Structure formats: structure tokens, C-alpha cells
């Protein structure tokens, strides 16, 4: 009944959070001031379980090796081997050759499966290892209060319903109901997705326990202030514990590439059993007993199986994944490398994914003008004009009044990514001034702070007074920052270009509308003001304290506003631009507040400029929001409150009829529902995320993508791909790479599949026309696994035949990896020419040695007879067994060599699906080496001493080598004019029938 459990886990949560503290403690049986008794604490601690999450339920043993050994393809090779062993077992009905033949073959198949499995396993294992190196868990001991006494204990020993105090920097030990607070801002960024630190208070605010201020949450750090609360939830019963357990309990789903390979297998086995059965019937129709007919059936069916293609495919994927790793894009699973290329929809998280999740100075107000700062992580943007003195004054104000200072070990670090002790805004301002205006060290210690007023519980104005560094005016300098409206209430004079003024309502309301414009932009704005002091009235020795009014808190000089927000990562906007350019639909899914969500959306290009939401239309036209027709709105910001009341058809409609979509204030479960909703459309969905709220989403997605550093642990475990450098642009590279490796795969496949016609046909007409066997088993293996390997791998290094990021995402139903047209080429056309070349070489050799082709018919019966030592050729000569057999085996080697020769042409034409070879070209080096090494290998096998003893391969009389040549040239010319006509006529009959 775990179905019901996961059904309760996909539902958004509920709480007791709204209670009189009297009723709270009445329910939980606790003292608010004194907590509860140690006896009771230890009683509850052993009553259920310690406070911590149950370790991930998944701990698969290295026996998971077996996983790599089956899949769908390795399975095909397995049943191949099994059939071989069965065939040899049937050949135990007599005294039989397969000691070198069928047993050999089955064992070889087994070997391929096992080895490839070993390789892939080692790769995934390696990724898992480098991932393990990244896990660091530091014990953080909670501060409890029991029997009235404050005691700091291991966080795992915390129980339900006992008093807990959290301080600045402290991580919240378990889920709490805040009874009391002072200036307390907790950071909910990872859990609910709220960007800026949310304050916490005793009072009940919002009905939804996630947005309310009287609840503090597990795994969240308290940014500032202090708070006391009773523990509502402990361990797995907590919020992120439920999220985590939901994440652990979801399903991966079948990756697109795996499905394509499954279908491919269906094709291959299809023609396998068709040939096998039809030829079984055919064989019975002539002479051969059910014994022979069965052996032939197994023979053909197994023969149709591509042994080496497992290796080549695995290696292909591994190579691409290698490049991915080079770019600091790590893939947990090997087949997940493709998925991006098949993705038509990207659901992205906002904070920590699309953005930096770091409060940063955005815009500044100087001389009634807005100057945008550089918000990028790497400082790749444009610096403002700092020549003006107004900026100097402002920067000194922001730098001098703060609690913000750099910590001990931040020097060598970049000024942005380096750590800072202080508030959000204070951190942002500190970094900004340290960046643009130079160091705030000698600058803040230049002016000596006398008496300061920290942010007040009411009106939140923060002022401080310093002495004068300047050599002209020895006046005391006063500085204050605070909310724009209150500081507007307390300010009179305004400063411009280094000289003062009073306030006129024109530029005062210019300031007002500038403040409302920047505030509407999603940013948080702070008023900055200063005043010189009348040092005649306040002498150099005057000590002013905080008691009475020392300074004229009114008639001050208002300087400007400094606004701040968490900016998108530097690489993000361009990335979203490319993804949109490739035809991928970008959807923003965040639990953050709508007002900021829409702004960031318009910023990163998820919502393009000029596209109006329903509400934008309603606002412009001065109309009730209900009136306007939703069809007229291309973009929409969907509120999470509504998403709870929404049905399947409704969500389907929202996703269908809106091009640019932002879901805001969405619970993790709802992220899951959105992903599933995009999957109901039958589309491939990729999810990019940062925090734990993306755990159920990233898991459910066809491919999940985490952030290597800014990402949390649970969502990192749930992800099928990790970005170690945290570069969003990588996603673009991804969808490029995966879209390329698709095409190349086809080529590789095609190549190998072409070889099976000239491989199988010798054993076919061996049965039919009763000629001596043209091509042996060892030779066939020397082609499949011996030679073609290096070319088939080299085909992976093929490049883009056109601009791929231009074309739309593939259709999973329509466009296939291996489809009708491929088979119709490889099996139908090219492979046939190959087979003909092979048989031609065969007849050349046998005719030159005294057996004319016409005479070779029906001969095999006596030919394969060991004991007939007088065998008449066309010249009347008598051959023994070993002599004519040596000729047959020296007919195997050239057939093999011929396969290589035609595989030259096949390799060059498989290089390009569309372009003529004189366009795309031979610039592939691995391919060249493929040809060279291939030819050299064949020549070696033929001419190496003792090879006729070992592999029963004999030295080719050299002119044999040229028999295959005209067939290779034919293959080349033919596919070249095919890839000409396809280019010239893109109707097209050749394009519809052949192009694959």
C-alpha cells in the first residue's frame, strides 16, 4: 500500500501553526518559557526516533554491476549467445566441427556482453566516485531550552515540542512554531524558493504554512536576529523530509535514447526472424532434415545480430560524455547524454538556477537619473560613470554606514563570491563599494564612527556620525539610510552635481516615480541621505549620545536611492535565447513571489518584451481583469494558489495556449505536477534546479539538471546530470551535443548494419546452391569485431552537416534513430553491392585455382566430406581434403579482405547523410586512421606467419586484393549521386525512400 503513501506525498501540506500560544502548549504539553523536562525529552527521543532523515533508502550493492549486463541490447547479444550454444548442443548429435565454430561464437558473444558491461559500469562508477568526493556533512548542534536552562545538544537529540532558540547564522534544527522573535530573518531560499530573507514573528500571517511567518523550517539557515519556538516537526516528519522522501520514491522513466534503441532492436530481430523462418521453410522444402533446418534457422537468426554495435554505441556515448565532463558537465547516467537534444520543453527554477541567489546592487539614483550597475558574477557588464561627485558622496554614505565587513580569510577570493558577515543589503552594498569605489577598509576607518543608531524596530532608520577626513571643512559628517518614504518624511535638501538645493514637488515626484519604477522592477530600494553638521553649534570636542536629539534629523540632505535584487547568472540570458532559438519552450517554475518572478522572467527572456499577460492587458485598458479574453494573452503568470484548484484539462489548456509561461509560488509537489503536465502533452521535459524543492521535479523529468555548488544535496541526488561549474550556458551546449550525437549514431549503426548482408549471404547460398562455404566464422568475427571497430568509432567524430541548432526538436513518434529508410539502404542497397563484390572475389579465386564457378554447384556435399580425396575440378585434376579446404580457407581471407575494401567506400559514404563528401569532407582524422589501421590489420591477418595454422587464414595472392575495387567504387559513386539528387531535389522520392 505504498501507492497510497506516495499519493499522500504528492499532495501539498497542512499544519497547526495558527493557535494561541496557550492552546499550542496546551496541545503539546510544554512550558513556553521553560521548555520541557529532560526526562520527558529523553522519553520522546526514544519514543519515535532521533531528529534526522532516514538515510537514502537506496543503497544498491556493487551487485548493481548486473544492471549493466542486461538492458535491452545486451539482452539481444545474450539470446544470441544462448541460441549459439543451443545450436552447438544440437550439433552434439554427431561428430562436429563447432569446437572451432559455434561454441567459439557463443562464447565470443558472451565476452562482448560482459566486457562492454564492464566498461560502461566502470564509467558510471567513476562518475559516482567523483560525486562522492563532493559530500561534506558538518554536525550542527541545536540550542534547546529544558527545565528553564539553555543547553546546546546534538541536533539529532531534539524532540517534538520543546523550546528552541535560533540566532544569527544558526541553522534551523527542526520544524518550529515561533513563539517569540527579535529582528529575525530566516533564509528560506532553498526550501520554498523565496529569494530575499523572510522575517519570522510569533503572529499568524498567511493561511498557507509555507508563506506564514510563525513557522521556521528544517535545513534553513537563520540570516539574522534571534527567535524562540516550539518544535512542531522532527526528522522525516518535517517538510523537507517529506519532500526528500517523495523524491526518493519517484520513478526515473525510460530515457528517449533507450527507447530508440529498443525500437531499433525490434527492427533487427524482425528481419532476423523473417529470414530465419522463411529460410527454415525453404530449407525443409528442398532436402535437409529438421536437424539441419533448425541449425540453419539458428544460424541465420544469430548471424543477423550486430555483436560489435554494442561496443561501438557504448564507446560513442562514452566519448560524448567525456567532452561533457571536460566542460564541467557531469552525467550520472551514460545514456542521459542524449536527452537534451530530444527536449522540447525546459522547466527551470528561478533562484540559484536562473539567478545567483545573492542579493546584489542593481540600480542607483544620481542627479535624478537611474544608473544600472554590473550585476554579473564575473563582472562582464558595463560600469557606470563614477566621475561625478554625487556618486562619491553616495558611495561614502553606503560604505561608511554598515555593520558589513569582510571576514578573515577573504582576500585572494573574487570580491563577489567571497563571504561577508552582515545583512543581505549590507553585504550587497559592501561588495558594491569595495568593487567600484575602491577599498572600504581605509575608507571606513578614515572616518571615525562616534555614536550610531542600529536599525530601529519601528521606522527602521539607521544613522551614524563620523569626523571629517577632508582638509578644507572640519565639520562632523552625519549619514543615514532607510525606507524611501520615511527618509522622504525626514529629508529636505537634495544634492546635485556637488551642490545642494531644496526639494521641489517636480523632482520630488520625479524621485517618487523613480522609486515606484525601480520598486516595480522587482528590486528592493533603500533611501540614502547625509547631512553636514553646524560645527559652530556642535564643536570638535562635543560628545553626542543617543539619548536626546543631537543632530537635526529633519532638513537633511537626501542624496539618492540604491536598489538591489538577486540577478540572473551571467551566462543565463544568452542561454535562454539560444534554447528559444532552437525551438525549445522555456517555462519558469518557481516557488517565489509573482512580482519578482515575472521581472526575472522578462529579464532572462522567458517572457519576451512586448508580450502581455492577462493582467497587463487588464491594467492598460483600465478594465476588470475578468473581462479580457485569455486568448489575447500570449504570456501568463500563474499563481500557485490557483494551481491547487486546477484540474488536468485546465493545466493542459494553460500549457497549450500560452507560449511564455511562469508558474510562481509553486510548491515542490506542484512542480512535479507541472512536469507531469508537460509530459501529458507527450513532450520531452528537462528540469533545471537548485534547492530541495526541485527534488521531485528533477527526478520525474526525462532529464534532471542540478547545480554542482549552489544546488542542494537531495536535488543533486535526484538529478540525472550535474553542472560542476554552475554554468547555465552548458545546457545549450548539451542540446547541441545530444542533437549531434544522434545523427552520428545513425551513421555508425548504418555502417555496421551494412556489413551483415555480405556476412550472412555466404552461408545463405551455401545452403541454397550447395557451393563450398565462401566466408567462414573466424573471418566474419574479424570483420565485426576486428576491423570495422575503428571506423565505426571514428564515425562518432563526424561533425554537424548543417546548423543543427537551427532545426526544430525531433519528433519521438515520427523521426526515428533506426527507421525504414536506413534498413532499406544498408540491407537493401549498399550491403547487396558488398555481397556481390565478395562473391566475385570468391569466384575469381576458385576459378583461377581450377574450379570454374558453374562447376562449383552441388559440390559442397562431396567438398565438405573429409574422406573423399579424389575430387574433380573443371580441368580433371583430383584434390584431397586438406588441399581444397586450404583453398576454401584461402577463399575466406580474401572474402574478408574484400569486406574491408567495400567497407572503405561504405565508411566514406556513411560519413555523410546528406552532404556530398566533397563538401563535408575528410577532415576527420580518426576516420583516416581508421582506414589505414583497418587495411593494415587485414593485410597482417592475411600475411602474418602461422595465421593459417591459428585462424586458418592464408596469405592472399596479391591481385586478389583488386577484385573488390570496382564494387567499392560503385558504392561510392552511387551513394554520392544519391546524396546529390537528394540535395538537388528535396521533394523528394530519393529523400523519402532513402535518406535516413
Amino acid at each position: 500500500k505504498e501507492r497510497d503513501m506516495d499519493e499522500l506525498k504528492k499532495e501539498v501540506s497542512m499544519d497547526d501553526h495558527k493557535l494561541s500560544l496557550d492552546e499550542l502548549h496546551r496541545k503539546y504539553g510544554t512550558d513556553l518559557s521553560r521548555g520541557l523536562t529532560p526526562a520527558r525529552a529523553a522519553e520522546i527521543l526514544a519514543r519515535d526516533g532521533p531528529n534526522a532523515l532516514t538515510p537514502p533508502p537506496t543503497t544498491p550493492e556493487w551487485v548493481k554491476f548486473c544492471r549493466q549486463l542486461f538492458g535491452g541490447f545486451s539482452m539481444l547479444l545474450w539470446i544470441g549467445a544462448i541460441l549459439c550454444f543451443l545450436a552447438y548442443g544440437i550439433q552434439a548429435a554427431t561428430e562436429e566441427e563447432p569446437q572451432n565454430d559455434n561454441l567459439y561464437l557463443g562464447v565470443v558473444l558472451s565476452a562482448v556482453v560482459i566486457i562492454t558491461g564492464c566498461f560502461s559500469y566502470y564509467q558510471e562508477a567513476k562518475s559516482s566516485k567523483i560525486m562522492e568526493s563532493f559530500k561534506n556533512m558538518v554536525p550542527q548542534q541545536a540550542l534547546v531550552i529544558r527545565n528553564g536552562e539553555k543547553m546546546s545538544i546534538n541536533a539529532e537529540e531534539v524532540v517534538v515540542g520543546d523550546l528552541v532558540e535560533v540566532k544569527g547564522g544558526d541553522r534551523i534544527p527542526a520544524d518550529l512554531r515561533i513563539i517569540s522573535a527579535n529582528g529575525c530573518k530566516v533564509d528560506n531560499s532553498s526550501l520554498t524558493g523565496e529569494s530575499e530573507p523572510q522575517t519570522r514573528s510569533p503572529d499568524f500571517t498567511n493561511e498557507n504554512p509555507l508563506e506564514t511567518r510563525n513557522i521556521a523550517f528544517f535545513s534553513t539557515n537563520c540570516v539574522e536576529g534571534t527567535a524562540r519556538g516550539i518544535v512542531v516537526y522532527t526528522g522525516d516528519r518535517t517538510v523537507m523530509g517529506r519532500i526528500a522522501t517523495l523524491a526518493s520514491g519517484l520513478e526515473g522513466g525510460q530515457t528517449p535514447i533507450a527507447a530508440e534503441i529498443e525500437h531499433f532492436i525490434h527492427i533487427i530481430t524482425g528481419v532476423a526472424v523473417f529470414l530465419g523462418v522463411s529460410f527454415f521453410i525453404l530449407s525443409l522444402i528442398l532436402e535437409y532434415t529438421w536437424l539441419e533446418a533448425v541449425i540453419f534457422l539458428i544460424g541465420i537468426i544469430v548471424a543477423n545480430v550486430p555483436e560489435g554495435l554494442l561496443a561501438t554505441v557504448t564507446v560513442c556515448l562514452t566519448l560524448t560524455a567525456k567532452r561533457m565532463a571536460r566542460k564541467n558537465c557531469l552525467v550520472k547516467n551514460l545514456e542521459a547524454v542524449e536527452t537534451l537534444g530530444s527536449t522540447s520543453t525546459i522547466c527551470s527554477d528561478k533562484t540559484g538556477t536562473l539567478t545567483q541567489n545573492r542579493m546584489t546592487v542593481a540600480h542607483m539614483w544620481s542627479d535624478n537619473q537611474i544608473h544600472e550597475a554590473d550585476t554579473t558574477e564575473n563582472q562582464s557588464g558595463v560600469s557606470f560613470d563614477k566621475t561625478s561627485a554625487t556618486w562619491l558622496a553616495l558611495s561614502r554614505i553606503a560604505g561608511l554606514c554598515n555593520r558589513a565587513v569582510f571576514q578573515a580569510n577573504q582576500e585572494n577570493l573574487p570580491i563577489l563570491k567571497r563571504a561577508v558577515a552582515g545583512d543581505a543589503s549590507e553585504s550587497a552594498l559592501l561588495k558594491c563599494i569595495e568593487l567600484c569605489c575602491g577599498s572600504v577598509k581605509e575608507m571606513r576607518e578614515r572616518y571615525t564612527k562616534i555614536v550610531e543608531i542600529p536599525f530601529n524596530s519601528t521606522n527602521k532608520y539607521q544613522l551614524s556620525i563620523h569626523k571629517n577626513p577632508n582638509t578644507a571643512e572640519p565639520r562632523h559628517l552625519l549619514v543615514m539610510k532607510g525606507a524611501p518614504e520615511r527618509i522622504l518624511d525626514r529629508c529636505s535638501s537634495i544634492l546635485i552635481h556637488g551642490k545642494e538645493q531644496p526639494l521641489d514637488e517636480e523632482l520630488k515626484d520625479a524621485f517618487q516615480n523613480a522609486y515606484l519604477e525601480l520598486g516595480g522592477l522587482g528590486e528592493r530600494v533603500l533611501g540614502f541621505c547625509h547631512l553636514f553638521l553646524p560645527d559652530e553649534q556642535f564643536p570638535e570636542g562635543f560628545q553626542f549620545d543617543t539619548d536626546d536629539v543631537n543632530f537635526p534629523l529633519d532638513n537633511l540632505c537626501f542624496v539618492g536611492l540604491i536598489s538591489m535584487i538577486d540577478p540572473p547568472r551571467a551566462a543565463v540570458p544568452d542561454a535562454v535565447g539560444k534554447c528559444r532559438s532552437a525551438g525549445i519552450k522555456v517555462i519558469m517554475v518557481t516557488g517565489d513571489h509573482p512580482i519578482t518572478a515575472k521581472a526575472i522572467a522578462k529579464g532572462v527572456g522567458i517572457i519576451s518584451e512586448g508580450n502581455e499577460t492577462v493582467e497587463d492587458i487588464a491594467a492598460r485598458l483600465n478594465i476588470p481583469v475578468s473581462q479580457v479574453n485569455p486568448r489575447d494573452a500570449k504570456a501568463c503568470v500563474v499563481h500557485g494558489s490557483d494551481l491547487k484548484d486546477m484540474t488536468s484539462e485546465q493545466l493542459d489548456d494553460i500549457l497549450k495556449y500560452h507560449t511564455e509561461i511562469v508558474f510562481a509560488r509553486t510548491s515542490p509537489q506542484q512542480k512535479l505536477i507541472i512536469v507531469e503536465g508537460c509530459q501529458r502533452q507527450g513532450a520531452i521535459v528537462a528540469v533545471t534546479g537548485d534547492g530541495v524543492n526541485d527534488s521531485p521535479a528533477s527526478k520525474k523529468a526525462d532529464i534532471g539538471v542540478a547545480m554542482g555548488i549552489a544546488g542542494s544535496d537531495v536535488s543533486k541526488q535526484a538529478a540525472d546530470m550535474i553542472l560542476l561549474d554552475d554554468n547555465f550556458a552548458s545546457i545549450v551546449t548539451g542540446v547541441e551535443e545530444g542533437r549531434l550525437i544522434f545523427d552520428n549514431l545513425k551513421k555508425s549503426i548504418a555502417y555496421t548494419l551494412t556489413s551483415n548482408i555480405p556476412e550472412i549471404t555466404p552461408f545463405l547460398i551455401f545452403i541454397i546452391a550447395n557451393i563450398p562455404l565462401p566466408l567462414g566464422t573466424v573471418t566474419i568475427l574479424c570483420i565485426d569485431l576486428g576491423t570495422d571497430m575503428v571506423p565505426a568509432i571514428s564515425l562518432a567524430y563526424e561533425q554537424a552537416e548543417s546548423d543543427i541548432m537551427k532545426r526544430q526538436p525531433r519528433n519521438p513518434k515520427t523521426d526515428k534513430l533506426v527507421n525504414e529508410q536506413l534498413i532499406s539502404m544498408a540491407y537493401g542497397q549498399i550491403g547487396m553491392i558488398q555481397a556481390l563484390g565478395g562473391f566475385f572475389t570468391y569466384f575469381v579465386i576458385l576459378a583461377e585455382n581450377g574450379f570454374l564457378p558453374i562447376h562449383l554447384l552441388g559440390l559442397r556435399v562431396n567438398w565438405d566430406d573429409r574422406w573423399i580425396n579424389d575430387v574433380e575440378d573443371s580441368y580433371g585434376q583430383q584434390w584431397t581434403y586438406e588441399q581444397r579446404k586450404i583453398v576454401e580457407f584461402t577463399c575466406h581471407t580474401p572474402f574478408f579482405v574484400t569486406i574491408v575494401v567495400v567497407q572503405w567506400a561504405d565508411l566514406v559514404i556513411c560519413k555523410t547523410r546528406r552532404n556530398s563528401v566533397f563538401q563535408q569532407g575528410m577532415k576527420n582524422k580518426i576516420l583516416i586512421f581508421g582506414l589505414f589501421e583497418e587495411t593494415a590489420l587485414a593485410a597482417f591477418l592475411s600475411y602474418c606467419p602461422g595465421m593459417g595454422v591459428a585462424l586458418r587464414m592464408y596469405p592472399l595472392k596479391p591481385t586478389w586484393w583488386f577484385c573488390a575495387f570496382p564494387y567499392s567504387l560503385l558504392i561510392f559513386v552511387y551513394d554520392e549521386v544519391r546524396k546529390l539528387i537528394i540535395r538537388r531535389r528535396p521533394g523528394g522520392w530519393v529523400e523519402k525512400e532513402t535518406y535516413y
Binding site: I928, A936, A939, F940, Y943, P945
Partner: protein, 32 residues
């Protein structure tokens, strides 16, 4: 006699070839 072939010479030729072709391939994949 027609019944004697030089197999050792052809053998040598093929092997020499294999060596040259392979090391040339090696020159090719290393482009510096």
C-alpha cells in the same frame, strides 16, 4: 616447375605494407 609459388615474398610484402600503413596512420592521428 609451375608448382612452386613465392609465398614468402608476397608475405614479406604484405607485412612491410602493414607496417608502413599503420605507422602512416599513426602520423595521421598525431597532427601536433
Amino acid at each position: 616447375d609451375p608448382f612452386y609459388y613465392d609465398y614468402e615474398t608476397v608475405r614479406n610484402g604484405g607485412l612491410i605494407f602493414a607496417a608502413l600503413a599503420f605507422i602512416v596512420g599513426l602520423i595521421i592521428i598525431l597532427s601536433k
